[PDB]
Amino acid sequence: TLVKQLSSNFGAISSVLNDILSRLDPPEAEVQIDRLITGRLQSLQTYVTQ
Amino acid sequence: IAIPTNFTISVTTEILPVSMTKTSVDCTMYICGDSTECSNLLLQYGSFCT
Known part of the structure; x- marks a missing residue:
């Protein structure tokens, strides 16, 4: 379940960090990358608590 | 000695x-x-619910 959740968008336009990165300007990609970061931190924290 | x-x-x-219950x-x-649209948004978050 932890390895999966790297394929989840969490609301961004893509789960591939580079695709977001190489397909938008910095100020617009920052929000998407922050959304991915928040989702992945939440997943890792859930794993650690369990 | 006390007996x-x-x-x-x-x-x-x-x-x-x-x-417990x-x-x-x-x-x-x-x-x-x-809300079906809410469910469509929610499924982008992955296996949090399973």
């Missing part, structure tokens, strides 16, 4: 919990209710 000459039969009580919760009905 007893009589005795008492004492009945004491010890209370111990053994079980079994609860199940469906995400889609808690986060989204009957």
Whole structure:
């Protein structure tokens, strides 16, 4: 379940960090990358608590 | 040396919990209710609900 959740968008336009990165300007990609970061931190924290 | 000459039969009580109520919760009905668009947004978050 932890390895999966790297394929989840969490609301961004893509789960591939580079695709977001190489397909938008910095100020617009920052929000998407922050959304991915928040989702992945939440997943890792859930794993650690369990 | 002090020695007893009589005795008492004492009945004491010890209370111990053994079980708690079994609860199940469906995400889609808690986060989204009957909204299909909400469910479509929610499925982007992955296997949090399983």
